[PDB]
């Protein structure tokens, strides 16, 4: 996250880190054994860390637990990012409590003007790498559809949506892929691409998760 704050430890409580030996992307816990991220941060041998705060240091609240499978959605086109999700079932669940926690899933898309909350241990420099230790937020509003058109022409399907700062200094980057935009208490977006992070007239692009609704609820109820 480029132009964020510190979150504070376990405030955001549906935030995991997947991690193969190192973190390398984000996710958010829906259930206490299903975590929702993004199907380009796939891989096997994945490890889902919740209640995390500092990634480098156990200071207690954490849960690790490995992942049974991934499933990636079967539309998943990698040169497009369209359909842009995956879901991940634990091996055994979560403890839920204030600090480990799920969202929920949202009952009708957002608007834009919307403000959000996108957090996650992703680069905080548009120029060079710089990861945190702790986890990083930012509040961000959805942009308007022919704002993001005009931002990337022929790259945005309706799976997406734009969110940010055209003025640059402000977005999600490297690092925070397949982590949450909550709107309202509401599970909105996944952190997904942009060109470049935090450069004026490229906002972040997610994958708009209210069209994946039903989806979602087929998959987990068959597994
Ligand atoms: N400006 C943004 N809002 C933004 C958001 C998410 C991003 N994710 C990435 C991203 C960039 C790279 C390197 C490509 N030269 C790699 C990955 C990547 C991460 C995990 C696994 C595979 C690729 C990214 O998610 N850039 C991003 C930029
Ligand atoms: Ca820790």
């Given at each position: ?27 958010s816990l829906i259930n206490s054994q299903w975590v929702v991220s993004?199907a ?28 049974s499978k991934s499933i990636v959605h079967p539309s998943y ?5 369209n359909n842009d999700i995956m879901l991940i079932k634990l ?11 799920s969202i929920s899933l949202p009952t009708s898309c ?48 309706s799976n ?26 509401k599970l909105?977006?996944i ?16 994958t708009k998760v209210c069209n994946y609704v039903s989806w979602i609820k087929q998959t987990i109820a068959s597994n």
């Open positions: 996250i480029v132009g964020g704050y510190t979150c504070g430890a376990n405030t955001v409580p549906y935030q995991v880190s997947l991690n193969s030996g190192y973190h390398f992307c984000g996710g993004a380009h941060c796939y891989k096997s041998g994945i490890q889902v860390r919740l209640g995390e705060d500092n990634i480098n240091v156990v200071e207690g609240n954490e849960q690790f637990i490995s992942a086109n990698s040169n497009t990012l091996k055994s669940a979560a403890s839920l409590n204030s600090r480990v926690a957002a608007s834009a003007g919307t403000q959000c909350l996108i957090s996650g241990w992703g680069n905080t420099k548009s120029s060079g790498t710089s990861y945190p230790d702790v986890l990083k937020c930012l509040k961000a509003p959805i942009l308007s559809d022919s704002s993001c058109k005009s931002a990337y022409p022929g790259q945005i399907t997406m949506f734009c969110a940010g700062y055209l003025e640059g200094g402000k977005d999600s980057c490297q690092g925070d892929s397949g982590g949450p935009v909550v709107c309202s208490g909105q977006g952190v997904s691409w942009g060109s470049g992070c935090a450069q004026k007239n490229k906002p972040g692009v997610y």
